[PDB]
Amino acid sequence: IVDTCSLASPASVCRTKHLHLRCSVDFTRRTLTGTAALTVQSQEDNLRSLVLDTKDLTIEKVVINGQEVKYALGERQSYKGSPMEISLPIALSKNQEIVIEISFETSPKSSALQWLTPEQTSGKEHPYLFSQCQAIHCRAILPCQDTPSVKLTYTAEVSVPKELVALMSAIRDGETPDPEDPSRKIYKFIQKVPIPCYLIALVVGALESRQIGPRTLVWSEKEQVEKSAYEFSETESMLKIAEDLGGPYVWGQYDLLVLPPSFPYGGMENPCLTFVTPTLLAGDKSLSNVIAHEISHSWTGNLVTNKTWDHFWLNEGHTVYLERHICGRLFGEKFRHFNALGGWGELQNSVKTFGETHPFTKLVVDLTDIDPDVAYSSVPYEKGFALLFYLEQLLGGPEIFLGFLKAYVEKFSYKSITTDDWKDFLYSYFKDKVDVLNQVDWNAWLYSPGLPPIKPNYDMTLTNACIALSQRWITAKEDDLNSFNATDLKDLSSHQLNEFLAQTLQRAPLPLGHIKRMQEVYNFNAINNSEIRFRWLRLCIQSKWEDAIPLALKMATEQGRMKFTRPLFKDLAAFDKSHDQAVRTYQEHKASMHPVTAMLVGKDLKVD
Numbered sequence: 001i002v003d004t005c006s007l008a009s010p011a012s013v014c015r016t017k018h019l020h021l022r023c024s025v026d027f028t029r030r031t032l033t034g035t036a037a038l039t040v041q042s043q044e045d046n047l048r049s050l051v052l053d054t055k056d057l058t059i060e061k062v063v064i065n066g067q068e069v070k071y072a073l074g075e076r077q078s079y080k081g082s083p084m085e086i087s088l089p090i091a092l093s094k095n096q097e098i099v100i101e102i103s104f105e106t107s108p109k110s111s112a113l114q115w116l117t118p119e120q121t122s123g124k125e126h127p128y129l130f131s132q133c134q135a136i137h138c139r140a141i142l143p144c145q146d147t148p149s150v151k152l153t154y155t156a157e158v159s160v161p162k163e164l165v166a167l168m169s170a171i172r173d174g175e176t177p178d179p180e181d182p183s184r185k186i187y188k189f190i191q192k193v194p195i196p197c198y199l200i201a202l203v204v205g206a207l208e209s210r211q212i213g214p215r216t217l218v219w220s221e222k223e224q225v226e227k228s229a230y231e232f233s234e235t236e237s238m239l240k241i242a243e244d245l246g247g248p249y250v251w252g253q254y255d256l257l258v259l260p261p262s263f264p265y266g267g268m269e270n271p272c273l274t275f276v277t278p279t280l281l282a283g284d285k286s287l288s289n290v291i292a293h294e295i296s297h298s299w300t301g302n303l304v305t306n307k308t309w310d311h312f313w314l315n316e317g318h319t320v321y322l323e324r325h326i327c328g329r330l331f332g333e334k335f336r337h338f339n340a341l342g343g344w345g346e347l348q349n350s351v352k353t354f355g356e357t358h359p360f361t362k363l364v365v366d367l368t369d370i371d372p373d374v375a376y377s378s379v380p381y382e383k384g385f386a387l388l389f390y391l392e393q394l395l396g397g398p399e400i401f402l403g404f405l406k407a408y409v410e411k412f413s414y415k416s417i418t419t420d421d422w423k424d425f426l427y428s429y430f431k432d433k434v435d436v437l438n439q440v441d442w443n444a445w446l447y448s449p450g451l452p453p454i455k456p457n458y459d460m461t462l463t464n465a466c467i468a469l470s471q472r473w474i475t476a477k478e479d480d481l482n483s484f485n486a487t488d489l490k491d492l493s494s495h496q497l498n499e500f501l502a503q504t505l506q507r508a509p510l511p512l513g514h515i516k517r518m519q520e521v522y523n524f525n526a527i528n529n530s531e532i533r534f535r536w537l538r539l540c541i542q543s544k545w546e547d548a549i550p551l552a553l554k555m556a557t558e559q560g561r562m563k564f565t566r567p568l569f570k571d572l573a574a575f576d577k578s579h580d581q582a583v584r585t586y587q588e589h590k591a592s593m594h595p596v597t598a599m600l601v602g603k604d605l606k607v608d
């Protein structure tokens, strides 16, 4: 079996067991320079040459056994990058290992990194850097078998300006002055647990920490540290629940790093140090479900890993399932069901957007010649969760299925697996209910496009009030407008307000006068909760409210979480009154945008 997203030699020929990383972070040249010492193990006899993934990497030299060797860079294959075939002096046989030392330089345009000028940061005095390697961007930082089917420990030391701090997806070893006498510190890191390379992460900036748990520090620039330490207080209690569900948390520390507004995702499950968007800082902890989710990846994702990106749903489907149990443990089973039903709604939106026969709406996909960033959506999260939730109900409830979940984590820990490994284990574990398992339409669930063949059962308690109010607005006529009032919101939680807007948004456009009335009675303009403001502005713009144009333009650019930024640029482009300003705003911003985000919005807007 082969990973169609990688150009490297497959795990069935050789495997990287370890990486030693020495490098310094160069803010003036906007480059990472250093050496990548890979311990490779052969899986065959007479292994004379292996191939690594690269993207826009400058190779300075490839040293083996103190001596240089003959390497070659192949032709670029668009988004995949270019294959780097290294020549081995002495032939390897089964399980024989060799260590290879690549001196490399990263391009300023690395799709894995965003370099921020001081003016792009909170503290206007210092620069900032961060990586984001998932899915296949690790090769844009260094030569590697850039596939999730390979796992490896790594050790790292990195030189940065002594006024700054380096952090990695590892335990911090310590800080010492650089060997070449610059004004630089050389920070050290160690990761003892085998991880896929997409989990290698690096941040370099004016970072400042604050402890919020026994195994948790929150890291951010000085001006965010205080609000964050508050927002994520619940973190350790979520960790404890996660361990109960998943088994022991094996990574040692669980730190949190709150990144600059342009971080592309809500969170990245970097081991030991989760990355999160600043858009979670709502000031009432209401978005802590994202934290629960990242915590859950410490088992589903980071311990048991999808073997290729075709089986990405294993990572995310299970993690969303654990996420919603943690929140259910914390706030009640009726809340777990509210969140699950909301997810089905987001799945509905994804299928309608792509189209119900579209290949990206299948649970298991084929990313041959597809850039994984382009296929990314809520489908693997929500169709994967739906399947696990349907199976929970089919097989006798959450207690029974969480037993399966923990056994599943236990069986495949430290491994990389496919949809079949999962399904075959489900059958093994539930060998006493095989006749129940044979009732499920596996082909449709796993391989058919569109909404799943069957919808699970959801408790409606917390959802009913959302439906009542959305339906009143959707069907409102002139003689209804005067009766709407802020008391409508009186008993609705932040989560219900959001779901109200999500439901209303599915029936957009609403009449313009109706949306003006909504602002008039609810004052949604004044809410800064990002999930809620996101959907409110989408509704205003799709309903042709010109006054919402600058609001939407502002949110789309003042932060770069793609979940918010892409749909806003897309709505603004679709609205004739804002189309031109949308396209010009993008073009004026694409230079200081994250590289992947810049590219995706461009394709969205069809610019260039």
Ligand SMILES: N[C@@H](CC(=O)O)C(=O)Nc1ccc(OCc2ccccc2)cc1
Binding pocket: 134, 135, 265, 267, 268, 269, 309, 310, 311, 312, 313, 365, 372, 373, 375, 376, 377, 380
């Ligand atoms: N940004 C993180 C967020 C997180 O970890 O929660 C992330 O997982 N990114 C990501 C993951 C997979 C990708 O490609 C695989 C794929 C397969 C099937 C369908 C769609 C995409 C591309 C990007």
Ligand SMILES: [Yb+3]
Binding pocket: 477, 479, 480
């Ligand atoms: Yb009426």
Ligand SMILES: [Zn+2]
Binding pocket: 293, 297, 315, 316, 319
């Ligand atoms: Zn996830």
